Amino acid sequence: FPPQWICCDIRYLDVSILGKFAVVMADPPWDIHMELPYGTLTDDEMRRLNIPVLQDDGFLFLWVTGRAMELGRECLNLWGYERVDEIIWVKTNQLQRIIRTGRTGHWLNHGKEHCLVGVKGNPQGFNQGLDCDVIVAEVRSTSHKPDEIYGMIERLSPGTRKIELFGRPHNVQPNWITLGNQLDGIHLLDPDVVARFKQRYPDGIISKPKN
Amino acid sequence: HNDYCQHFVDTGHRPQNFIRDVGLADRFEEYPKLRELIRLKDELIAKSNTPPMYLQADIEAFDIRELTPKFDVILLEPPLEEYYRTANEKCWTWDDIMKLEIDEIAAPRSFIFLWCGSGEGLDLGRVCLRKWGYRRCEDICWIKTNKNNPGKTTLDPKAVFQRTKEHCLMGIKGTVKRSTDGDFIHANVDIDLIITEEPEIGNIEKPVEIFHIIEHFCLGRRRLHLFGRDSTIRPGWLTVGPTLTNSNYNAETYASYFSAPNSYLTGCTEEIERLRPKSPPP
Ligand SMILES: [Br-]
């Protein structure tokens, strides 16, 4: 129930051991058919993520950009969700102004990041309409998405277990299990998850499955 | 810093209320070179603008091929049933919208700007773009502030957040290369956001800034506004819609403004070529 995390390769981790989650969130390194200073996952690697086993009833927050506006919609569909909202993060500078200059998009400049909101099954105990679908926040440090999204999700679905894919050390927090290759080792607290992790990885090495 | 999401929960003031310096006319008052680029481009638009042209038509029944010549940009705001949730004119389902034969009037290289609302249209408008032969290439969000009326003013379908924006999807048809086609587009002159105050109830107009973004971006002079109204009639545009009270469109006269000795393109001055954003040498 305090912060929990697993350093891992998202493509290889047997995510069936973590149980079910009321909220799933991912800010993935989409292959956006552009030159990037970090590694990406192919479209097929993204489609094949075992998102469906993480949840029977609940919400998905999927950050998207570029051609992943459409590929993210296809993933939502493949993983069993309907899209019911779309949040944007409007980026401001230190004077709370929009930075309008540069060449920050292919055709128009880009002032926001998009997050698809999907629903699966028939969730209960959620509070609809507490937050707006527009986030206004400065770009801070290494952040790729704004920290405000965690408060919105917690107000939407308080007290439920949540899981984040492709998360970073800064993102670990109560009620969340954070998965990502930049995390420091493995820190599990939920005794149910610990038991299943030991049964599946008898010696702690989360390696590619024996094909 | 402060959490403006929490501030909204506490106060009803939307986060976008605290973005500074959003006004269209007053935009670059403190940024003289940016102001000059916009001013020169608007002057270039005004110099080449056709006089206002408009046609009353029942777009559902109309043979859309009667609109000639081909269009470099098309702006479409079909009246969605979600805009009225007090209907007056015919409301359009996304099936109705998809049936429009847009590909029959769009130029071989051209752009479309489709107001999609904030619900199912974000998905179904993309299907329309596919059908019409465009690729979705930008998403212009109209963000609405509620400075005048805080603050819980909602709600429509299966939403879970309060919806405070509308999306205008931009599509591209044909091949356009930013490296070689600077006589057709000026990229990166505007950003994909418009920020204004929530209009009065029952006012369904979209922000006039959408025209500025389109006119700055594409140098094609043949501009069609489908489902425009009397109040959107504008030089440089052909406005077509059922609620227009009068018509002056003559397809031959309209076409003559773009044919020899004229061009369907605005051209450009040396001063604008030196100010507008361009890629560096390879
Ligand atoms: Br068509």
Swiss-Prot record, chain A:
Residues 97-110 are annotated as: Positively charged region required for RNA-binding. Residues 94-111 are annotated as: Interphase loop. Induction: Overexpressed in a number of cancer tissues, such as lung adenocarcinoma and colon adenocarcinoma. Changing N181A: Slight reduction in methyltransferase activity. Strong reduction in methyltransferase activity. Changing N109A: Decreased methyltransferase activity. Residues 82-86, 96-112 are annotated as: Interaction with METTL14. Changing Y38A: Strong reduction in methyltransferase activity. Belongs to the MT-A70-like family. The METTL3-METTL14 heterodimer forms a N6-methyltransferase complex that methylates adenosine residues at the N(6) position of some RNAs and regulates various processes such as the circadian clock, differentiation of embryonic and hematopoietic stem cells, cortical neurogenesis, response to DNA damage, differentiation of T-cells and primary miRNA processing. In the heterodimer formed with METTL14, METTL3 constitutes the catalytic core. This is N(6)-adenosine-methyltransferase catalytic subunit METTL3. It comes from Homo sapiens. The chain holds residues 369 to 579 of 580 of the full protein.
Curated annotation (Swiss-Prot), chain B:
It is found in: Nucleus. Changing S279 to A/E: Does not affect interaction with METTL3. The METTL3-METTL14 heterodimer forms a N6-methyltransferase complex that methylates adenosine residues at the N(6) position of some mRNAs and regulates the circadian clock, differentiation of embryonic stem cells and cortical neurogenesis. In the heterodimer formed with METTL3, METTL14 constitutes the RNA-binding scaffold that recognizes the substrate rather than the catalytic core. N6-methyladenosine (m6A), which takes place at the 5'-[AG]GAC-3' consensus sites of some mRNAs, plays a role in mRNA stability and processing. Its main location: nucleus. The keyword DNA-binding does not apply. It comes from Homo sapiens (Human). This is N(6)-adenosine-methyltransferase non-catalytic subunit METTL14. The modification Phosphoserine is found at S279. GO terms for biological process: forebrain radial glial cell differentiation; gliogenesis; mRNA destabilization; mRNA modification; mRNA processing; mRNA splicing, via spliceosome; mRNA stabilization; negative regulation of hematopoietic progenitor cell differentiation. One of its GO terms (cellular component) is nucleoplasm. Transmembrane segments: none annotated. Heterodimer; heterodimerizes with METTL3 to form an antiparallel heterodimer that constitutes an active methyltransferase. Component of the WMM complex, a N6-methyltransferase complex composed of a catalytic subcomplex, named MAC, and of an associated subcomplex, named MACOM. The MAC subcomplex is composed of METTL3 and METTL14. The MACOM subcomplex is composed of WTAP, ZC3H13, CBLL1/HAKAI, VIRMA, and, in some cases of RBM15 (RBM15 or RBM15B).
